[PDB]
Design a binder for this molecule. Sequence first.
Ligand SMILES: Nc1nc2c(ncn2[C@@H]2O[C@H](CO)[C@@H](O)[C@H]2OP(=O)(O)O)c(=O)[nH]1
Length: 104
Amino acid sequence: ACDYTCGSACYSSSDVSTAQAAGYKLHEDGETVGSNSYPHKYNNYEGFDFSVSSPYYEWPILSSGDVYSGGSPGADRVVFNENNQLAGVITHTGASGNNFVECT
Ligand SMILES: Nc1nc2c(ncn2[C@@H]2O[C@H](CO)[C@@H](O)[C@H]2OP(=O)(O)O)c(=O)[nH]1
């Protein structure tokens, strides 16, 4: 059940999969939502060791289980590439500034 732990938020494989599908879809159609225009390029400034090739894109995953639609994105993100492969699940929770830490 608790496949990904972002601070206090708990996400299953299904939650991540659903969010990723939604984010990849908007990416494919060239659409964005929210004040920060998601999904958008994730440059991996943090230098996480992803097993899949770039380019990466960040998209909000909501603890409520809802699919992001432009409102408040929260602290967590799913990262995917052009092949719709999951690079990882990251969060602002437990990090300084606008930096990210990986969910475990
Ligand atoms: N922390 C962080 N920000 C990134 C990265 N790639 C792009 N950004 C964007 O660069 C800026 C400074 O962090 C923000 O606009 C941020 O977008 P988000 O705020 O949407 O994540 C990344 O790999 N890490």
